[PDB]
Amino acid sequence: PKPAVELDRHIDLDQAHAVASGGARIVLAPPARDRCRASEARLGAVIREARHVYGLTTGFGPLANRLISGENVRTLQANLVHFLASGVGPVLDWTTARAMVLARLVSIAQGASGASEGTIARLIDLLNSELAPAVPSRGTVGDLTPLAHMVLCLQGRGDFLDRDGTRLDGAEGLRRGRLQPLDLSHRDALALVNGTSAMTGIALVNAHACRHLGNWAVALTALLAECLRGRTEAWAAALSDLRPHPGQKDAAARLRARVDGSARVVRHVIAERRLDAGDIGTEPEAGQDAYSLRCAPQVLGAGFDTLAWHDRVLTIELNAVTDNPVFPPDGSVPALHGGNFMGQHVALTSDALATAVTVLAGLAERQIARLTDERLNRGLPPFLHRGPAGLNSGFMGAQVTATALLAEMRATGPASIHSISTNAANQDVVSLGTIAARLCREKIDRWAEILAILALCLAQAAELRCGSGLDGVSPAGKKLVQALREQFPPLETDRPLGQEIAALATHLLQQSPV
Amino acid sequence: KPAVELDRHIDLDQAHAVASGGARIVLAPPARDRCRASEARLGAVIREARHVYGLTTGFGPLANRLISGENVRTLQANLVHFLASGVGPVLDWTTARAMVLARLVSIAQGASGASEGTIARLIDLLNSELAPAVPSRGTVGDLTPLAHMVLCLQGRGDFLDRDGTRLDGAEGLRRGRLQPLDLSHRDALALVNGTSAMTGIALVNAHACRHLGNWAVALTALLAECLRGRTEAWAAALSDLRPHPGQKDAAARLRARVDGSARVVRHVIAERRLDAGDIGTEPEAGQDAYSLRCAPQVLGAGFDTLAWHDRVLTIELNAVTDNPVFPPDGSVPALHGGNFMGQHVALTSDALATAVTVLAGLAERQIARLTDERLNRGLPPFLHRGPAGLNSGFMGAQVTATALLAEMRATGPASIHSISTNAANQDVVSLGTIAARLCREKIDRWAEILAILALCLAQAAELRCGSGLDGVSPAGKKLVQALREQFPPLETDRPLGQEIAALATHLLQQSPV
Amino acid sequence: KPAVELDRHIDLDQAHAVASGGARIVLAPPARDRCRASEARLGAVIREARHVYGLTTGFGPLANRLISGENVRTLQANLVHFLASGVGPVLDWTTARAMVLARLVSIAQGASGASEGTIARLIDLLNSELAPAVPSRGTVGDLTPLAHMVLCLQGRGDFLDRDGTRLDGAEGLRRGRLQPLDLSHRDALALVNGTSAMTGIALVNAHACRHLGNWAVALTALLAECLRGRTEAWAAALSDLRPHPGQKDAAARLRARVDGSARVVRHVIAERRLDAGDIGTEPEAGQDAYSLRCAPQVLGAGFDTLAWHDRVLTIELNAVTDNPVFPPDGSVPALHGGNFMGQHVALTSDALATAVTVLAGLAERQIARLTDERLNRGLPPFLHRGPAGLNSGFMGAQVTATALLAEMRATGPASIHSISTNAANQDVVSLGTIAARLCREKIDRWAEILAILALCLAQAAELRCGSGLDGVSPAGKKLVQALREQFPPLETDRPLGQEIAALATHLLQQSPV
Numbered sequence A: 001p002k003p004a005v006e007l008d009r010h011i012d013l014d015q016a017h018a019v020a021s022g023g024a025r026i027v028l029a030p031p032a033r034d035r036c037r038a039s040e041a042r043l044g045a046v047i048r049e050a051r052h053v054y055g056l057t058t059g060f061g062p063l064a065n066r067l068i069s070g071e072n073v074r075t076l077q078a079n080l081v082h083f084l085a086s087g088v089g090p091v092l093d094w095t096t097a098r099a100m101v102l103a104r105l106v107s108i109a110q111g112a113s114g115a116s117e118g119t120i121a122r123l124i125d126l127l128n129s130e131l132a133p134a135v136p137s138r139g140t141v142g143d144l145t146p147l148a149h150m151v152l153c154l155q156g157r158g159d160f161l162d163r164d165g166t167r168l169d170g171a172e173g174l175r176r177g178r179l180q181p182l183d184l185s186h187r188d189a190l191a192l193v194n195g196t197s198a199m200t201g202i203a204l205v206n207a208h209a210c211r212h213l214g215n216w217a218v219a220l221t222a223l224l225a226e227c228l229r230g231r232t233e234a235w236a237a238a239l240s241d242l243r244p245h246p247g248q249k250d251a252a253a254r255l256r257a258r259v260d261g262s263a264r265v266v267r268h269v270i271a272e273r274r275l276d277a278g279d280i281g282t283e284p285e286a287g288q289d290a291y292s293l294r295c296a297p298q299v300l301g302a303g304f305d306t307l308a309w310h311d312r313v314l315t316i317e318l319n320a321v322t323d324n325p326v327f328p329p330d331g332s333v334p335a336l337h338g339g340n341f342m343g344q345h346v347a348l349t350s351d352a353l354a355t356a357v358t359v360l361a362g363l364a365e366r367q368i369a370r371l372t373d374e375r376l377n378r379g380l381p382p383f384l385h386r387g388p389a390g391l392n393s394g395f396m397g398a399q400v401t402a403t404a405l406l407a408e409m410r411a412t413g414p415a416s417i418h419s420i421s422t423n424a425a426n427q428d429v430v431s432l433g434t435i436a437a438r439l440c441r442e443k444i445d446r447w448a449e450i451l452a453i454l455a456l457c458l459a460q461a462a463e464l465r466c467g468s469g470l471d472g473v474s475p476a477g478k479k480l481v482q483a484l485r486e487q488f489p490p491l492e493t494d495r496p497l498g499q500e501i502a503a504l505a506t507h508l509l510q511q512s513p514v
Numbered sequence B, C: 001k002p003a004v005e006l007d008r009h010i011d012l013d014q015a016h017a018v019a020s021g022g023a024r025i026v027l028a029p030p031a032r033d034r035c036r037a038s039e040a041r042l043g044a045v046i047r048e049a050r051h052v053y054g055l056t057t058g059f060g061p062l063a064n065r066l067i068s069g070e071n072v073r074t075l076q077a078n079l080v081h082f083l084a085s086g087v088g089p090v091l092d093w094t095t096a097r098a099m100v101l102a103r104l105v106s107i108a109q110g111a112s113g114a115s116e117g118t119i120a121r122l123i124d125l126l127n128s129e130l131a132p133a134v135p136s137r138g139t140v141g142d143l144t145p146l147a148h149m150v151l152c153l154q155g156r157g158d159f160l161d162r163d164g165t166r167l168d169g170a171e172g173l174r175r176g177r178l179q180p181l182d183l184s185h186r187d188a189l190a191l192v193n194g195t196s197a198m199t200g201i202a203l204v205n206a207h208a209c210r211h212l213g214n215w216a217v218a219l220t221a222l223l224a225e226c227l228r229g230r231t232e233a234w235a236a237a238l239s240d241l242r243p244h245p246g247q248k249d250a251a252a253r254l255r256a257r258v259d260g261s262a263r264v265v266r267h268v269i270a271e272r273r274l275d276a277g278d279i280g281t282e283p284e285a286g287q288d289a290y291s292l293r294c295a296p297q298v299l300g301a302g303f304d305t306l307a308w309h310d311r312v313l314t315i316e317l318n319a320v321t322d323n324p325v326f327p328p329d330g331s332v333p334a335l336h337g338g339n340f341m342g343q344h345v346a347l348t349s350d351a352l353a354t355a356v357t358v359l360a361g362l363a364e365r366q367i368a369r370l371t372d373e374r375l376n377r378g379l380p381p382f383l384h385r386g387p388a389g390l391n392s393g394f395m396g397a398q399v400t401a402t403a404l405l406a407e408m409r410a411t412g413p414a415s416i417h418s419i420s421t422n423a424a425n426q427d428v429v430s431l432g433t434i435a436a437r438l439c440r441e442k443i444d445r446w447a448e449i450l451a452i453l454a455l456c457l458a459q460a461a462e463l464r465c466g467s468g469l470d471g472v473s474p475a476g477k478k479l480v481q482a483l484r485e486q487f488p489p490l491e492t493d494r495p496l497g498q499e500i501a502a503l504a505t506h507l508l509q510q511s512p513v
C-alpha cells in the first residue's frame, strides 16, 4: 500500500518530504484535531466579541488603521486573496508546491491559527491526492503572494499540476483529485497566507536533494580514488579525531566505507617506509595526493556541517507557528500581534547552504578536470576517449560544460542582503527568504549536472583503468558503475551527451548510490 | 592580571582574553607533558629516517624530491623564506596575537612535534604587550601570514605595540623580552601548516559580534522608547510558538531592556472590544513597522548564525590543523592528510558576514525611520535642535549610515572563488582567511552604523522625554547617561565624523551594561 | 614646473599632471572673466531675494523651510558642519588633489557663482605640495568628502604631505603658505554639491590603468619569449577580421614588443604542407594556449572598456555638476535639477572594475602556466635555482597571486545597491564614489599580480636565455635590465613580499618604455 504520516505536533524532514513527494499519505492525529477545534472555537469568540484583531476588524499592512465592520469581514478577506495574487514567473514544481501546502498545514496543526476543520481538511485532501497547486514562483519578499495563489487554486480558481508538471484548470483539478472547493470562514484567508510556508517548502526539498547529492559526492570521490591510485591514509579516522568536526568525521568514514575491498587504491601509510642514502632522489609521484582527493573529508565535511545547521533550523521552522496574529491556546489573551512571518532564519540558512553547494560543486568540477587531463590522470587517455585519439575526443566537450555550469553558479550571491523598505515603509525590512531558497535550489540543480558528468566520466575511467570486468574495483564501486551502465552505455565513440547528462542529473537528485 | 591555563580546551572568551592582553597564558603541566612526548616522537621519526613530508621531502608538488637528513635545516629555513610573499596592511594587534594563540593551541594537543623552545616563544609573545607585524594578504587558506609570524619571532620582522606603532625585529625582541625563535626538526612546518590566521581573525570577529549584538538589542529597545513602540510583539508567548533559540533570546533581552519603561505601549490590542462608532480611520495602526515588530525574528536569525559560527570555531580553535601529524598513541609514525584545509571557517565566516549585513540593514532602517519627520511620530526632522532649516541635525549622518551599508553589500562570500593553484596540487582552496577578513570589514561598518543610531537615539530620547529622560527605563537612562559622558547633545550642527568613529571603536569592545 | 592653463577643457593627462603635482595650474583670462561674471550673477540673485536652494531655503527635505537673508551665512556654515560625518581612511594625496581639481574645473565653467577668493584657495592648494585629509566613506554619490575638504581649507581640518603624513589645519595653512578659505554667498554649497570626489578617484584610476595595461602587454610579450610563443596569433590580419579598436591596438602593441626576438615562433603553420610521413603525434600543438593566443582579444576588451570609461569621465570632469546652477546666458536667474547625480561615473567605474578583474585573471593564469613544470616547456618548477626541493623559488608568490585574484572577485558592482535615504528625498542614489573606490582597490590588486608576473618573467628569461638574454627582443631585454636594477635574481629562496609591494607601486606610476 502506502506509508502513513500521522501529524500531531512534530514531523521530521524525512516524513515531510515523504508526504510532499506523495510517497506517504497524511493523517491528522486525534489530539491535533482537538487542539484545532479548540482554536476554531477561539477565533469564533474573538469575532463575536468584536476584538481589535488584524485581518478581522482592520485593513491590511499600513491600512490597518482603517477599522472594518463585522458585516464586511467576508469581503475583506476575499479581497485579501485577490490583491495578493500578483505573482509572476514559472510555477513551483509539483513536489515543492505540495511541500508549501504541507508547511502551512503543520503551522495550523499547532492549534493557534483558528483555522476551521474544513480548511484543514482541504489541505490534507490536497496532500493525499496526486495533485499540487500551480503557483507562480516570484512576487514575495518573504510568503503572501505564493500562498494567495495557492488559495485560489484550492477554490478551483487556479490551475493544478499533476506529477509531470502538466497543468489542469481549477475545475478539472477539484474533479480529478476529488477535492472540495475551499470555503473560507473567519480568518482562514489570513491564516492560509501569513507565514513562511513557501520558503520552508522550497528549503525542505533542497534539504532532501542535498542529502542525495552529498552521497554521490562521496561515492564519486571514492571511485575517483580507485581510478587515480588515490591514497586512503588521508581518510584515516585518526585524522578526523584530531579535528573533530562532525561533518568531517562523517565524510571520512563514508569515504573509507566506499573503497572498502578495493585493490585499486594505495593503502600504505608512507611514514612506515624507512629511507636510506640510496632513496635520496626524485620519485615519479609525490607521497600525497592533490587536494581534490586528500582534502575531500575537510571540504565535503564543511558542506555537511552547513547542511546540518540548515536542517536543524528548518526543522524548527517547519514545526513552528509562522502566522500573525496568533491565538494563544492557554487563553491568556484573545490574540497576539507580532512578526512570526518574518523568514529571516530560512533566508540566512538558504544563503549559507547555497554557498556550500557552490563550494562542493567546485570540488566535483576540479575532480572532472583532473581525471580528464592526460597530464594529471596518471596514464588514462586524454578526456577518457576510446578509439583513435584526435578523431575521438571523448568527454572533452562535457568537461567544458561542467566548468560552464560552475561558472554560472558563482555569478549569483546571497539573496538576504538585498532588503528594501516596501509597503509604504511598513515592511521596512524584509527577509527575501523565498528568493534565497529558490536561488539555492538552482545551485543544487547545477551541482547535480556537474556530478552527473563526473559520474559518466568515472564509469568510463574505471573501465579504461580496470577493464570491462572492473578488476580490483571495490564492491561498492562495481555496483555503482554496473547500475549506471544499465541505462548509460560506454563511450566507445563520440556522441551527444547532453540528454544523458540531464537524465542522470534528475536521478541523482532523487536517489543515492547504494 | 588574570591567567588562562591551557591544557586541552579553551573557550572563545578565554581565547580573546589572552589575545587582547586581558589575561596571561600558562601551559598546564599535562599539556607540557604531552608536548614533550610528541617532541620525543618527532626525534624518533627523524632518527628512523621515516618518509615524512617536510622532514625527508620537498614541499607541495616538489614532495617527489626526497631530501637527505643533513639538508633538513636548510630545507626548513628556505620554507619560511619562499612562503614570505605576503602583501597588504598588517593584521591588527589583537588579531595577530589571536593567530599566535591559535597556533599554540593546535600545538598543545601534542601531535605536532614542536620543541619546548618553540612553544615557549609563542607563550612569551602572548604574555608580552607585542604582536608580530604580519601582512594580511597572500594566503588561500595560512602559510603566508604564519611564515611572516615566524620571521618576526626570529627578529627578522616588525612587531606591533598595542597602539599599532611598528618596531623593528631587534627592537621587538628587546622591548618584549623575547628570545629569538630557534627552529628545530619540523618546527618550521608546524608553525606554518594550519588554519591559525583565519581562526584568529574569526575569534576576534566572534567577540566583536557579541558586543555589537548587545548594542543592536539595546538600541532597538531605546528606539521603542523613543517611538512609543508596542511591547506585545516581543512577548515570550510568540517566541514559544516559533522556538528558534536566537529569537527567544532576542525577545527576552528586548523585554529586559525596556523593563520599567513608561514610554513603550504595553497594551495587548486584542483586549479592546470595538463598537460601531469606532469604525473609521484611526490615527495609528495597531501594530508597529517591521524595524520594531520583527526585531526578535531578524536579530534572532543573526544570533543563531553567530551561534553556529561559534560552535564551529570552538572546534577549529581546539583542533590540530597541521600536516603531517604524529599520532600520540604511536599507532603509525605519522599521518598525511589535509587538516590545514580551512573550509569550515570559510563557510561560517561567509554566513556570519551575510548575517552582519542583514543586521546592519536593520539598524540603517531604524535610523531612517527615527529621523524622518513623517515617520518618527512628532520628533523634529533629523532630530535637530535650534531653528529648523538653519539646522539639519543628523541629516548628514543619516546619509552616511546608508552609504556604509551600501558598501557592505557590494562584497559577497569569499568561499565560492576557489582557483586551482600550486601547479594544480592545490586544486581546491578554502579562501578562509579572506572570508574572515571580509567578515571583519562588515563588522567594522556595522559598528559605525550602530554608533550613528546610538547618537541619534541619545538626542531623540532627550527630545521626547526631556533632559531628565522622564519615563525612560533604568537601562535606557543608564545607556544615554553613559554616552553623554563623552558625547554632548547636538544643540547646534557640528562635524560628527570623528565622534562616530570614536564611538564605533567602543561598541566593538564593550556592551551596554 | 610645467603649467596647465585652465580655460574650458582639460584632458585626463593634464588633470593627473596637476593632481600629481607634476604641473602647476593657472586660470586662463577667459575663465577668470566668465567666473567673475557668474559671481556677479550670484550677487544679483541674492540682492533680488530670488527663491534659490541654499540661499533662501533649507537643505534636502528641509528645503520647504524658507530662510531670511539675515541668516544665510549661518545656514551655509551649518551646511558644512552637518555634512562632515565622514569616516574611514583618508583619500590618498593624489586622489584628494584630483578631487579639488575636479571641483575647480566644474566652477571654471562659470555657472556656480563662486567668488575669486574661493577659486584662489583651490588653485593655491593645487600649486602647493599639500592635499586635504578627507575621509573616504560617507557619501552616496559627494557632499561628505567635499565638506571635509572645506573644513581642511579653512584650517579646521588636517592636510597631507606627499608621503601621507598628517599635518593639523594650522600647520597646513602655514607650511603651504595658504590663506584660510573665506566663504561668501553660496560658495559653501558650490564647493559641496557635485561629483568631484568620484571624478577625482576615477581620473586616478584611469591613469593607473593605462600604465598597468602597458605592463600587461609587455609581460604577455615577454611570456611569449619565455615559452616559445607563436606570433601568428597576433597578426594584424586577424585584427582586421574582428575590428574592435582595443583588439587591434593590443595586437599591434604585442607585435611591437617582440620585434627583434629570436625566441618566439614566427612561422604561420598553414604554410607547411604535410605528407604521409608527417601524420602522427607531434610534441606540441600548432597553436598556443589561450593565455597567449587570446591575449589580443582579452586585453582588447579591457582596453575598450577603459576607452569608454575615459570618454565618459572626460565629459564628467569638464561638466558642471552642481545644484542649483546659474546659466551664463542669463536666460533665468537659476535652475534646479540633479546634475550632482553621479550615475555615469558609477556605471563606468563598475564596468572598469569588472574589466580589471578579468585582466588580472589573465595575468594570474600566465603566472600559473609559467611556473608549472608540466606546462612551462622545460623551465624549472616555480622557476627555482639551486637544488630542487631544497629550493622552491616562486612557489609561495604564485599562490599569493591566486589569493589576490580570489579576493578581487569577492567584490561586485557598487551601483546596484541604491537605497532610499534622506527621508526618501534621495530615493535613488548612484553610489559612484563607492564604485570608484572599489575599482581602485581592484587596480591595486592587479598591480600586485602583475608585479609577481614581472619578477617571474625576469627569472624565467634568464633561466631560458642565460644571463645575457640571448635571443630576447630589444624591448624584453630593456625591461628585464630595468627590473634587475632594483630586483636581484632569485638565486636562493628569500622573502618576496616587500619586493612585490615595491614593484607594484612602480607599475601603477610608470610604463615599460
Ligand SMILES: *NC1(P(=O)(O)O)Cc2ccccc2C1
Pocket (backbone or CB within 6 Å): A054, A060, A061, A144, A194, A324, A325, A341, A423
Ligand atoms: N505581514 C503582514 P502583517 O502581519 O500585518 O505584518 C503585512 C501584510 C500586508 C498585506 C497583506 C497581509 C499582510 C500581513
Ligand SMILES: *NC1(P(=O)(O)O)Cc2ccccc2C1
Pocket (backbone or CB within 6 Å): B053, B059, B060, B143, B193, B323, B324, B340, B422, C395
Ligand atoms: N599545505 C601544504 P601540504 O601539507 O603539502 O598539503 C602544501 C604546501 C605548499 C607549500 C609549502 C607548504 C605546504 C604544505
Ligand SMILES: *NC1(P(=O)(O)O)Cc2ccccc2C1
Pocket (backbone or CB within 6 Å): B395, C053, C059, C060, C061, C143, C193, C323, C324, C340, C422
Ligand atoms: N543634493 C542635494 P539637492 O541639490 O537638494 O538635491 C540634497 C542635499 C541634502 C543635504 C545637503 C545638501 C544637498 C544638496
